[PDB]
């Protein structure tokens, strides 16, 4: 099981590109901050570099659900210690979560299984804090769980966990109650200690818990969690999102009529004076002036009469942050209406670290700000050692400021991208062109994808004309690589004239939309699917998501149904012969020699069919590519264990027959890069299991032997997304992920 040392690095996006539901400051050590994501693990801040370091890259293929980080706690007594509650909801039986523990700030981890599921991907994932460490006796932790599992506790520093049977209310609210197998209780929403009620080494006695139950949502124990009471006088009707106890004694709570991160059309903010028992409604807006939940909540530890909250979600014209310096008695908004439609602003956005966050819309107007302040602002935090620093997560990035108190003196708060080092995108495709200025073009969920000349530079340009959220396929003409085609999902309710295909003749720098798209009767395709471009660029083959496979030899001025190939097929172009395309579906390989107009099933046998047991079409793992420079040389990776058809196959006769490589016991992806010096065949790059070892492997000898090029510290979870080499850089691999962005790596 030979390995070769490689340097693994992120292809930079600057902003991260996904949802950050939690930012967690340590309450005792200045500049110790963590960030948790829903699909891509967690991070620790580095003040010296102003950037984040992943603490999750050892998570691998089997244990991938550890990157669903539902909660995180950082120990205020021993700040080397950090813990996380991780897992996702799936359909699988026994897909339980775990509590992970680290004694070195997340450099290394140990894990304890829980007997129930954790929902790092589920609604309410930005509520918190749901995992907490007792600030007086740090061997005590509590976890507020989903699905009726209630309140759980450890008294041995997270090693073993047990249910707190006396907790009286496991939750009643369900986001989707009549939904089939989505009948799941949200559960507990947050836990907050009163640190004045313990002493060093002795358990904190007063604990507050918020529960997703609109009729009874706030509980207190005064005996360390032995017994619990619903607090008298509490408000009813809404769902608590955060509860923060200021050192003044005021417990602040944000409420919404949803749990987040999307739903929330009404909300309130309350405080409880914990000494006097009096509750006050301090909501910044009410009635028809409130059309959003309140989500994020922060108290300024250095100035604990200062509190801020965010909308979740106001949507239009933007979100709102509200700031009070008098305990909620009065609030200032971060923007106000002037003479309508104009607005006045207390902030300025700086996206120089990720200029694509303007989405290619350069003019920022009052009713259409670009960039927006944010969205999905479920978590807002003030640095407990610096009242001038705030950070918040959005659905795309982490924003923050270092001049927050300028708000109070009439200056503008400068809000900048504060996500350097974070990469959270899901990668649907990668191409590395063999000439031109770009080494890589990515196809991404949510933020479309980007073109790189320099892999270390945050993209300047968002992909527009067409503009969409998710690129599902991309290809280029091998023998005319300036010609690039991407397909995706245009949002036609927002822009009825947007197309789901974009074409470039300048290498992907600028795009245009063709005059037509595939249609059937009165139905025009919704797009998506996969695309292949002929070697010359004279034909585009689009395996649409909804209408099946179409081709165009007219640059998209018209589209014609392809004969002989089933809807949903995987498609690929020959890299030499412009008339030759390949397709694959359900264990059948197809070839066209008329530019995609007609396909024939070949005699190729033994490829996986994805049609046994319960297997669903979204489960099919298939990676099929033809080799640059050699007509009819086709590699295929994928399959599964239930069919006993999993591995890497090679054809040298245009798919007429395939031979399974006997030295690759499972494989999921294949890609090619520059031949090694002295060798005559392009290097191969695969995601595979080799003799029991899962990883990323390179072959310099056409698959006769393989060397592992990742390692146990650089695994990136379920890496079944995309891989390619670089035709101009020997040894370089580009690896897609589902939640860690794109990596590039080169031999040491």
The residues annotated as belonging to the active site are 38, 446
Answer for the pair 191, 200: CB distance below 8 angstroms, yes or no.
Answer: no
Output 24 or 415, the one with its CB closest to Mg ion. 24
Nearer to Cl ion, 89 or 589 (CB): 89
> What is the rounded distance in angstroms from the CA atom of residue 165 to the CA atom of residue 152?
8
Give the one entry of Mg ion, Cl ion, none that residue 475 binds, where binding means its C-beta sits below a cut-off of 5 to 8 angstroms depending on kind. Answer: none
Nearest Cα to Cα of residue 274 among 304, 305, 231, 308: 231
CB of 22 to Mg ion, least distance (A): 5
Q: Is 723 annotated as a binding residue?
A: no
Confirm or deny that 491 is annotated as ligand binding.
no
DSSP 551-605: EESSTTS--EEPBS--TT-EEEE-SS-TT-EEEEETTEEEEESSTTSB-EE----
Distance from C-alpha of 593 to C-alpha of 591, rounded to nearest angstrom = 7
Partner whose footprint covers residue 527, from Cl ion, Mg ion, none (CB < 5 to 8 Å by kind)? none
Q: Three-state SS string across 722-737, please?
A: CEEEECCEEEEEEEEC
* Joined tokens for residue 592: 């066209």
Stretch that binds Cl ion, among 261-269, 350-358, 361-369, 437-445 (CB under 5 A): 261-269
> 540: phi > 0 → left, psi -120 to 50 → alpha, else beta; which?
beta
When the beta carbons of 120 and 695 are compared against Mg ion, the nearer one is: 120
User: Minimum Å distance from CB 308 to Mg ion?
Assistant: 12
> Which is nearer to Mg ion, 25 or 599 (by Cβ)?
25
Nearest approach, Cβ of 123 to Cl ion (angstroms)? 6
Site for Cl ion in 97-126 (CB under 5 A): 124-126
Token pair 């600057």 is at which residue?
Answer: 14
Asked if 300 interacts with Mg ion (CB under 5 A), we say no
Count of residues interacting with Cl ion (CB under 5 A) = 11
379 makes contact, choosing from Cl ion, Mg ion, none, with CB < 5 to 8 Å by partner type, with: Mg ion
Which of 381/726 has CB closer to Cl ion?
A: 381
Rounded Cα distance, 155 and 148, in Å: 22
Select the span of 253-261, 434-442, 447-455, 690-698 touching Cl ion (CB under 5 A).
253-261
Per rule CB under 5 A, is residue 260 in the interface with Cl ion? Answer: yes
Known binding residue 379? Answer is yes
Say which entry of Cl ion, Mg ion, none residue 378 contacts (CB below 5 to 8 A, set by partner kind).
Cl ion
DSSP state string for 430-480: EE--SSSS-SEEEEETTTB--EESSTTS--S----SS--S-EEEEEEETTE
One character per residue 9-28, x = contact with Cl ion (rule: CB under 5 A): -------------x------
Would you say 536 and 577 are in contact if contact means Cβ atoms under 8 Å apart? no
The answer to whether residue 184 forms part of the interface with Cl ion (CB under 5 A) is no
Q: CA 106 to CA 81: how far, in whole Å?
A: 8
Are 453 and 438 a contacting pair, CB within 8 Å?
yes
Binding partner of 243, given Cl ion, Mg ion, none, CB within 5-8 angstroms per partner class:
none
| Interacting positions 360-399 with Mg ion (CB under 5 A) | 379, 381
CB-nearer residue toward Cl ion: 129 or 300: 129
Listed ranges 50-58, 70-78, 363-371, 733-741: which one lies at the site for Cl ion (CB under 5 A): 70-78
Nearer to Mg ion, 293 or 638 (CB): 293
Q: Which of 154, 155, 132, 136 is nearest to 196 (CA)?
A: 136
Site string for Cl ion, 360-389 (x = CB under 5 A): ------------------x-----------
| Residues 124-163 interacting with Mg ion (rule: CB under 5 A) | none
Residue nearest to Cl ion (CB): 260
**Contact between residue 150 and residue 167 where contact means Cβ atoms under 8 Å apart:** yes
Query: Of the two residues 23 and 696, which places its CB atom closer to Cl ion in the complex?
Result: 23
How many Å apart are CA 140 and CA 204, to the nearest integer? 9
Listed as own residue / partner, the contacts of 340-347 with beta carbons closer than 8 Å and 24 or more positions apart are 341/366, 341/367, 342/366, 343/317, 345/412, 346/407, 346/412, 346/413, 347/373, 347/401, 347/412, 347/413, 347/414, 347/415
Told to check if 210 binds Cl ion by CB under 5 A, we report no
CB 489 within 8 A of CB 415: no
134 alpha-carbon distance from chain centroid: 30
**Cβ 209 to Cl ion shortest distance, Å:** 15
What is the Cα–Cα distance from 277 to 284, expressed in whole angstroms? 22
Residue 40 CB, shortest distance to Mg ion, in Å, is 17
Q: Please, what is the minimum distance in Å from the beta carbon of residue 22 to Cl ion?
A: 4
Contact 327, 307 (CB under 8 A): yes
Residue 225: which of Cl ion, Mg ion, none does it interact with, CB under 5 to 8 A by kind?
Answer: none
Q: What is the side-by-side order of every strand in the sheet holding 162-163?
A: 131-133, 141-144, 151-154, 162-163
Is 261 an interacting residue with respect to Cl ion (CB under 5 A)? yes
508 lies in the binding site for Cl ion (CB under 5 A): no
Residue 296 interacting entry, from Cl ion, Mg ion, none, C-beta within 5 to 8 Å by type: none
Residue 172, judged by CB atoms within 10 A of its CB (0-12, 13-18, 19+), counts as middle
Contact predicate 629/479, CB 8 Å: no
Number of residues that bind Mg ion (CB under 5 A): 2
Contact 136, 201 (CB under 8 A): yes
Residue whose CB is less far from Cl ion, 16 or 632: 16
- Nearer to Mg ion (CB atom), residue 297 or residue 490: 297
Rounded CA-CA distance 674/578 in Å is 22
Counting contacts by CB under 5 A, is residue 129 touching Cl ion? yes
* Per-residue interface string for the shown chain with Mg ion, residues 249-288, x marking contact by CB under 5 A: ----------------------------------------
The only residue of 12, 15, 55, 71 in contact with Cl ion, by rule CB under 5 A: 71
Q: Report CA 169 to chain centroid distance, whole Å.
A: 32
For the CB of residue 653, give the shortest distance to Mg ion in the complex, in Å: 59
Residue 156 Cβ vs Cl ion, minimum distance, rounded to whole Å: 21
Minimum distance from CB of 298 to Mg ion (Å)?
8
726 binding partner (options Mg ion, Cl ion, none; Cβ < 5 to 8 Å by kind):
none
Stretch that binds Cl ion, among 256-264, 356-364, 552-560, 611-619 (CB under 5 A): 256-264
Q: Which of 111, 172, 119 has its CA nearest to residue 146?
A: 119
Q: Are the C-beta atoms of residues 648 and 688 closer than 8 Å to each other?
A: yes
For residue 52, the minimal CB distance to Cl ion (Å) is 16
Residue with tokens 């790092």: 120
Which residues bind to Mg ion, rule: CB under 5 A? 379, 381
Query: Which residues carry a binding-site annotation?
Result: 23, 379, 381
Query: Which residues carry a binding-site annotation for Mg(2+)?
Result: 23, 379, 381
Which residues bind to Cl ion, rule: CB under 5 A? 22, 71-72, 124-126, 128-129, 260-261, 378
């Amino acid at each position: 099981a030979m390995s070769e040392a490689y340097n693994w690095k992120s292809v930079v996006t600057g902003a991260g590109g996904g949802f950050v539901p939690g930012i967690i400051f340590n309450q005792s050590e200045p500049d110790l901050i963590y960030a948790r994501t829903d699909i891509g693990g967690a991070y620790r801040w580095n003040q010296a570099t102003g950037s984040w370091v992943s603490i999750s890259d050892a998570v691998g293929w089997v244990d991938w659900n550890k990157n669903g980080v539902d909660a995180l706690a950082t120990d205020p007594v021993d700040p080397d210690k950090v813990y996380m509650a991780t897992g996702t909801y799936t359909n699988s039986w026994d897909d339980n979560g775990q509590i992970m523990r680290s004694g070195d700030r997340g450099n290394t981890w140990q894990s304890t299984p829980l007997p129930f599921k954790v929902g790092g991907n589920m609604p309410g994932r930005s509520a918190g804090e749901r995992l907490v460490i007792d600030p007086n006796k740090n061997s005590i932790l509590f976890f507020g769980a989903r699905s009726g599992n209630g309140l759980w506790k450890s008294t041995d520093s997270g090693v073993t966990w047990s249910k707190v049977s006396s907790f009286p209310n496991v939750g009643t609210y369900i986001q989707n109650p009549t939904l089939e197998y989505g009948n799941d209780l949200v559960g507990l929403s947050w836990i907050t200690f009163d640190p004045n009620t313990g002493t060093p080494g002795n358990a904190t006695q007063t604990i507050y818990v918020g529960v997703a139950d609109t009729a009874s949502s706030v509980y207190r124990s005064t005996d360390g969690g032995a017994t619990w009471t619903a607090i008298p006088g509490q408000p009813t009707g809404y769902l608590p999102h955060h509860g923060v106890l200021s050192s003044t004694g005021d417990l602040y709570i944000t409420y919404s009529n949803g749990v987040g991160p999307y739903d929330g059309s009404k909300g309130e903010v309350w405080k409880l004076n914990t000494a006097s028992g009096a509750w006050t409604n301090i909501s910044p807006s009410a009635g028809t002036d409130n059309w959003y939940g309140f989500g994020g909540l922060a108290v300024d530890a250095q100035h604990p009469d200062t509190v801020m909250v965010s909308s979740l979600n106001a949507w239009w014209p933007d979100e709102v942050i509200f700031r009070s310096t008098n305990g909620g008695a009065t609030w200032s908004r971060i923007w106000d209406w002037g003479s309508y439609p104009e607005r006045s602003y207390k902030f300025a956005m700086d996206i120089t670290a990720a200029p694509w966050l303007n989405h290619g819309v350069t003019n920022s107007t009052s009713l259409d700000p670009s960039p927006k302040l944010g969205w999905m602002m479920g978590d807002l935090e003030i640095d407990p050692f610096n009242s001038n620093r705030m950070m918040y997560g959005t659905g795309a990035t982490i924003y923050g400021t270092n001049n927050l108190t300028s708000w109070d003196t009439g200056g503008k708060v400068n809000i900048a991208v504060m996500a350097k080092g974070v990469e959270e995108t899901a990668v649907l495709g990668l191409i590395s062109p063999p000439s031109g200025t770009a080494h890589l073009i990515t196809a991404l969920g949510d933020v479309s994808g980007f073109r790189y000349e320099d892999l270390t530079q945050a993209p300047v340009k968002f992909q527009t004309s067409p503009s969409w959220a998710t690129t599902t396929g991309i290809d280029f003409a091998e023998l005319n690589p300036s010609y690039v085609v991407r397909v995706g999902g245009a949002d036609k309710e927002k822009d009825p004239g947007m197309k789901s295909i974009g074409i470039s003749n300048d290498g992907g720098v600028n795009w245009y939309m063709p005059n037509s798209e595939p249609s059937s009767g009165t139905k025009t395709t919704a797009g998506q699917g996969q695309v292949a471009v002929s070697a010359s660029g004279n034909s585009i083959l689009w395996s649409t998501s909804d209408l099946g496979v179409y081709y165009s030899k007219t640059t998209g001025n018209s589209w014609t149904v392809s004969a002989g190939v089933p809807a949903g097929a995987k498609v690929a172009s020959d890299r030499v012969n412009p008339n030759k395309f390949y397709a694959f579906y359900a264990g059948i390989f197809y070839v066209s020699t008329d530019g995609g107009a007609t396909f024939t099933a070949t005699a190729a046998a033994g490829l996986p069919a994805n049609n046994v047991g319960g297997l669903q079409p979204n489960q099919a793992q298939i990676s099929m590519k033809a080799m640059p420079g050699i007509e009819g040389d086709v590699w295929f990776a994928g399959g599964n264990t239930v069919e006993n058809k999993y591995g890497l196959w090679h054809s040298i006769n245009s798919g007429t027959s395939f031979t399974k490589l006997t030295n690759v016991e499972e494989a999921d992806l294949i890609g090619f890069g520059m031949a090694a010096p002295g060798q005559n065949y392009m290097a191969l790059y695969t995601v595979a299991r080799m003799d029991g070892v899962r990883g990323v492997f390179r072959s310099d000898d056409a698959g006769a032997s393989w060397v592992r090029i990742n390692d146990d510290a650089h695994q990136y979870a379920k890496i079944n997304m995309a891989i390619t080499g670089d035709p101009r850089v020997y040894g370089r691999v580009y690896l897609g992920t589902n939640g860690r962005g794109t990596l590039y790596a080169d031999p040491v």
